[PDB]
Design a protein around this ligand. Structure first.
Ligand code: HEM
Ligand code: HEM
Ligand code: HEM
Ligand code: HEM
Ligand SMILES: [Ca+2]
Ligand SMILES: [Ca+2]
Ligand SMILES: [Ca+2]
Ligand SMILES: [Ca+2]
Ligand SMILES: [Ca+2]
Ligand SMILES: [Ca+2]
Ligand SMILES: [Ca+2]
Ligand SMILES: [Ca+2]
Ligand SMILES: [Ca+2]
Ligand SMILES: [Ca+2]
Ligand SMILES: [Ca+2]
Ligand SMILES: [Ca+2]
Lengths: 306, 306, 306, 306, 306, 306
């Protein structure tokens, strides 16, 4: 039902427009590509990729921007508005916000040096935002592996490769100190740091996130190549250098039987990882989409067309 | 206009409640899933899926339960009342009986081992029952293929796949002897059995439905897997083992030019059949629904809210 | 994702059927093998090998047959229809037109004496034709080397070997006089012939394409073996006997630094060329294919299944 | 590094001298202003504005005058020699040929009625001519929009305004029939004229360039004001009256998403166009200049000082 | 594309492991080396050396073990499983079953005293088994020479040396009486034994395979050195002592014009035969392999990885 | 005497070749761009940019690779050999190793995100390596500011901007712990750390370079953007975060009167820094070059042509 050539006759330049917008932002916000990939992920895990995450509050529904995994964390919204205005100008009423965000996530990966592919298209925009569902569906950094696995399965991403490949999104981007404190100082009430955190790195992290510092300070997800989309994320995991608990568990959990091989496999071959990432991405992009005449094609991503 | 996420913020647990109710019934009535799928079908073919079939007699209108294809045949009503009370208790005045029956039919298929999907929702309940329309719209086992085709077209299901896929509902469930007698003994006044009925099976059927037995005795629609929702129904058709005339005609009628390929196709691939079934089901679920402020959300499925 | 054994259980005889059809045509049209190889190439460069080039005009989309590089040039369509009818007869609804054209191109090469291999299979057919994209993506005979290189890169064929190997398709086949006139008489407004065209050959070409003759008259791409698929194409390039500008530039352009070695290499070893050709062909055959449930398996290559 | 006041103390009268020379030529060759603007453009696109285009053949290097876009097309050289002798007489050894040609191009625009500004100065003259680079860098009338865009980007003119503004140089000047024939009779082998050429104008052009006439006959670039530097060039584009393919594509190409607005914008306001032109011109004038002690200040523009 | 050093950095000990396993088996089953060489041959002739022959039945495909030339004949499977477990233990997920069987066949030859060489590596495992293709591609003992030649050509082994060299695999190993009965008693309905079978040997064979004995009793292929890989196989052919019809025909067929010289040549020089064998083996090992990312690296040779 | 257009007619593709080589290396060694910039610097400071640093030992002279500032520090040599072979293949005997290394250093800067410019060319290669001169001319991390200033002046880089701009090369790249130990623990026998090293950073550095760790472990020169060529290097200096003593002294030395303003100036404007860097680079590239017929054009950078 979704096809990569959906706009080829109706709006042949969409990807160019999306790409130009991102390249442009990158000059002022080098973090933009990572943020955008994350928005798509947060979009798709709550009722599919329907742009529900882009809606602002209304008297009929609460915005997903207030969900626990989005509040004071999700960012990049004005950039999406900018690309939407640009494409409305070129192909009035034709490209939905759901598709736009998908194309943008894909372009962000390629621009950060990752694989290049054409994402299936033709999704439509939701009529409401689902805050409660977002609170229930988004995974948290403190989940154990069986919990992460449960979280992915819940939305239909039932293969270990889905979880392992998609976690590679942590090959760039930033993370707040608040999310790693319980690991640097008192992990799970043991009164000691997380035993799976390499001790040399532990010292560095403590320097970046001092026990009485700013919890909103940012640290890079990938210590090797912080801004390049490549497979270094997996190399770090093998050395016990995954930044957040959910990262390290893919390699260090007693339940990581089925994941350790994929991790090793992705760490050994950039190509194997890229192919896997691309397939996992297209599976995530296919979660319960709105197609045909369901939903709408928003004029502005933040509000339902009236 | 109908969207699968309609209740996601208002009554997130509906499907769970519906599913639990059915699983529970299944312990005492293994036939319940089949019966429920049949109610939805009989609902949708008479003025759309508006729960009109669930209304009991009033002084202003006759119940569809007395229609020729419903009388002493349709069953499962108390189970619908039970799930309705359960959901009224969880989400007072929010889920209509039309939606409830749709969710229930879908859950019955999955629970019997069929595909799993999210049905479009947001239908509303009718204000009256349409007995005459039911007498005119419901197909009968003795219809020829052009008649079955006419019957489906009449309600908008105009593709051969609609008829072939939806007939796969006969992959489980029961059927009364009365409906196959004219085939086992004197078919169409020829004084002989239906030539399209495999002769070995003919003997078995005669053992189950003796010339002077109980016409209400039940036989399984699918001799291979009587209770499992799978594609065996089509395999039987190729061997001349379709139970009722309307089943066998999809493969044996001289007019079965456009249907034979679909039958063969569904018999060869469980996946092809499942996809087809799901699409056909969603097309049937979209017949002239009552949406927006039309119709109502009944407190009890058997009566109009006063 | 694409595998050479895709039809081995479902339609084991496809290649035989394709081969027999071509052998048969060859008796009446000795040019058929060359034409078919060219169709596949023109198919793959416009949204991948999805048989989009085979669709005829509809009210929703214009046919690619009217694209600048196809109009009054592309040929062989009725032969594809013939092989499609033959395979539909043997394996109803199983082999897509995209796969058929790929198998046909490969068989045409082998039958003209080239290498023999099994092409990866499992592609599906597009839902529309892309005329504008064809106008933008197909290379022209007057492109400079950096332009040819840009054209190939654009579709993902980013290696110099891709361009050099695939240009070897000019080892057989015909070309119209109109495409070489600017070279025989007034090259690039210099008022003189192309200095890279051997002068003895120049005289012959002028005899074949007189200044006031028929622009549609045909000349052979390869003067050594016009109909045999071998490496002579490269030997001609070293002697300044490439027929069209884009051919000669691979060896004579000031930017031909990376291509001259491959040309020399392919001219010295039939085996080296064959291996290269085969790999380049499989890379071209892998451009953004439609797989799984995307696109369809057409009953007739010229129209979308309704 | 380049400053508009470079000669203000050393040779305060240069512009006057340049202007007087042009005014004088204009009496005998009304086309001179257009030709001169074109020389500067052809100078700057090949290794920057270094007067490399003005050098005649030597035994060490071939003249750029033989490049494909210059041969039997570029003109105005003796007029440059005349202004050079005049300024050598006033300020011996002080003004380079690169600066002279820049001042001349600017004066030609103003004298034809365009904006007036002071161009940045201080460039120096090259030691050789670059024929191959000229063959690779100069755009041709048959390029598609993505090709024109690629051509400009290649030399550093990376904004759509650069291409759109600078194409306005076609607001005056002449063009040979040979460059529009493929459009009037057989466009891209379609056997039909270019569909983007207004049909009334098509007839006029055919009258000026008969199918068997003189290919060197000249037609005006701008049908509204052939000799006045103004924004009419853009008005013609909106009516499908751009003379050469590269002109019309800025408005009619499927890829003209980012250019159509600029075209419309320049067509609506002479001032907006003038400002844009001036900025684009100064960006082109800044391509990799030779400054300080690099290159030399030629005594005669056609030869390197020995 | 296939290289002998493929595992040298990833799993340097594979050959040692394979060799040790075979040496070990040899103590209990002296026939193991011959059987293994035969498995590789049967693997390669059905869709290339992709380990398709090692897969057991599934509901999606029938095992090739039931093919006419495999049923109650092919053996050695548990030994392959043993070496696979041993190498999985040393280099988890790195060596495919296709490569393993190739290395094993080569080691079996050397261990039986044949030449020693490094086989090209890097093949991958198939996703299905091809029973019908096996029934069509495997040669039978009763084929005439033109039929054997046709059989080899069909898979790409088009030289007479391929057939003659590879038939030398009969220099060791066993054969069932059933395959030589038609020759010892009633050859081709002549009511007489095969005239090309030396009469003294005929008597011995009759003693081993009595007219009413066990058809599964085994006789040695090579009467001179039954277990040593050497050229004696050819010496026997010259004396009319080839055991099965396809063996003797290489020397006695009226069509054996091109083969008789090779036979004589191999009978005269152990070195000439060894070189030929090795080259023929590497050509057979190169039949349509799955490389790069095609196919997979099985964890267990009998089943597809799920 | 040196001109940026030196190879434009003789080997127009050199820069492309150099750039492609580096882009390629970057995939495996992200540190390559930094290393290459450093080689050029070490080349130019010892008898000018004459590629003397690239020569290996001979019986007539010792290699500069053994100089104190090169031994177990300088790297990237095989990459230079690779680009040299590539350009010899395209323009035999035309580009010297001295020019190649200059182009490479410039390309490394741009590829890491720095300015883009065309370096003056035409240098030639030396006939010997100068080890003693290298020992005397290369600056060390422990030099005081007057010593650094003396070192630069000695080779002709007599402006404070030369030292300040060129020190910005430390905006990327790595440095060994051994070079910062005296600063982290016992600075200049004071028994205390360097007072000009920010104390928070001091802790981090100590974590990276423990008092009894590996002296060859690497730390990044720029803590803000370790791999991006930008002006952050200067921002760190103002916060006392220059990594090595010679870095911090430009801002903290009592003699830093003339340098502090430049540091502040470069920290405030990326453009000001880029312009300065480029000019400083071209001044360094002009140190006593071998031109005309002096020196030679090496076939291989490691040895003198014999
Ligand atoms: C194409 C025309 C159709 C005809 C003529 C027909 C006829 C029948 C008949 C006569 C029975 C048995 C009634 C009894 O013994 O009391 C029956 C049962 C059933 N039918 Fe159909 N049917 C048709 C289409 C469908 C469709 C489209 C569906 C649903 C998707 C369906 C689902 C069922 C099920 C599941 C049962 C068994 C119900 C139970 O056991 O309670 N039928 N049908
Ligand atoms: C590299 C750029 C290429 C250009 C500019 C180009 C151009 C052309 C032209 C102009 C013709 C003759 C058209 C006519 O007279 O009607 C032609 C014919 C042909 N081309 Fe190419 N071609 C290119 C690449 C390829 C590729 C990659 C293949 C296939 C692997 C190919 C295969 C053929 C064949 C076999 C013919 C003859 C077709 C026939 O006789 O019907 N070409 N090509
Ligand atoms: C965008 C791509 C461009 C193309 C493909 C192009 C093409 C041409 C052609 C083919 C001619 C006529 C040649 C002849 O008949 O001999 C011409 C003339 C001219 N072009 Fe362009 N041009 C381009 C850009 C420019 C630019 C940027 C300028 C200057 C700012 C310019 C200024 C002129 C002028 C003034 C003439 C007339 C010269 C005369 O009458 O002597 N062109 N151009
Ligand atoms: C002002 C005096 C300078 C001193 C004392 C100095 C010192 C050093 C030292 C000690 C290292 C690390 C060596 C190692 O760990 O093996 C280094 C690396 C580096 N230096 Fe400098 N340097 C100076 C000037 C420059 C200049 C002018 C440039 C170039 C424009 C430069 C570019 C680099 C680069 C890019 C690296 C990292 C190389 C790599 O990662 O391989 N340095 N420098
Ligand atoms: Ca969503
Ligand atoms: Ca990374
Ligand atoms: Ca109803
Ligand atoms: Ca069943
Ligand atoms: Ca296509
Ligand atoms: Ca040929
Ligand atoms: Ca120039
Ligand atoms: Ca004008
Ligand atoms: Ca096989
Ligand atoms: Ca033997
Ligand atoms: Ca030096
Ligand atoms: Ca930096």
């Amino acid at each position: 039902q979704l096809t990569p050539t959906f706009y080829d006759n109706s709006c042949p330049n969409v990807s160019n427009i999306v790409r130009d917008t991102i390249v442009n932002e990158l000059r002022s916000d080098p973090r933009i590509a990572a943020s955008i990939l994350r928005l798509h992920f947060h979009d798709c895990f709550v009722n599919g990729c329907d742009a529900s995450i882009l809606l602002d509050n209304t008297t009929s529904f609460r915005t997903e921007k207030d969900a626990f995994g989005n509040a004071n964390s999700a960012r990049g919204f004005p950039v999406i508005d900018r690309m939407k205005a640009a494409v409305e100008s070129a192909c009035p009423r034709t490209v939905s916000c759901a598709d736009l965000l998908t194309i943008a996530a894909q372009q962000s990966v390629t621009l950060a040096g990752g694989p290049s592919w054409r994402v299936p298209l033709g999704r439509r925009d939701s009529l409401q935002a689902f805050l409660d569902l977002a609170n229930a569906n988004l995974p948290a950094p403190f989940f154990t592996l069986p919990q992460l696995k449960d979280s992915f399965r819940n939305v239909g991403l039932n293969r270990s490769s889905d979880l392992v490949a998609l976690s590679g999104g942590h090959t760039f981007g930033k993370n707040q100190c608040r999310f790693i404190m319980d690991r640097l100082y008192n992990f799970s009430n043991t009164g000691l740091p997380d035993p799976t955190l390499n001790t040399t790195y532990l010292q560095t992290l403590r320097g970046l996130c001092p026990l009485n510092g700013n919890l909103s300070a940012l640290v890079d997800f990938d210590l090797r190549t912080p801004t390049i989309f490549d497979n270094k994320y997996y190399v770090n995991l093998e050395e016990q250098k995954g930044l957040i608990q959910s990262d390290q568990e893919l390699f260090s959990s007693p339940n990581a039987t089925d994941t350790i091989p994929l991790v090793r496999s992705f760490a050994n071959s950039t190509q194997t990882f890229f192919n896997a990432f691309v397939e996992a991405m297209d599976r995530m992009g296919n979660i319960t989409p709105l197609t045909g005449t369901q939903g709408q094609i928003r004029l502005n991503c933040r509000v339902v067309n009236s």
